[PDB]
Target: 40S ribosomal protein S12
Amino acid sequence: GVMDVNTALQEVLKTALIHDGLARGIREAAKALDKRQAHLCVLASNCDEPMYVKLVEALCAEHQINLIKVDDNKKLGEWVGLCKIDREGKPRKVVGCSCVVVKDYGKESQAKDVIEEYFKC
RNA sequence: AGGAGUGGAGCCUGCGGCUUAAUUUGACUCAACACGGGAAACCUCACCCGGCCCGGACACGGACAGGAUUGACAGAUUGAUA
Model:
């Protein structure tokens, strides 16, 4: 029923992870942005380094790509598969670019659609 | 009974000794010594002098979105576009 951003993001990030995409970390996410292979950016909050977040806003703005501002980067690490080991490990991933469409070539779920619906307004 | 011999010469080969950084070593009566199919330039390769590589699965902990991987130049190689 309800598919708010904070629950469709997990679905879209996972579904991308099965089908490549998901450029994790500031490096290679900046590469996806400059190379213009990106379709969605997920910047995490509570990032101490101001230059980090400011530069990723700059990249997204100039490249005209949507930007999601989630909190608790560790949760982003869970979502993008950085955790592994059941539910242990958990490195922070405070930025991620969803290459080859917001969704992936495997499936086109409506959870992808809610993202663009929320971004249109 | 004899034939061809060889042991003598020079050379080719295997063995010991000597030598050497190293002259890798197995096998000393028949039943070791042109034997290991052993005619070694490299390779072979075991030996000697130098120098790269991990091709140290996997399990458990650290570190980690930057763990870690290549690398052009000049030095340097106390040999090399290592």
The CA atoms of residues 103 and 112 of chain A lie 6 Å apart. Residues 5-121 of chain A form a domain with the 60s Ribosomal Protein L30; Chain: A; fold (CATH 3.30.1330.30).
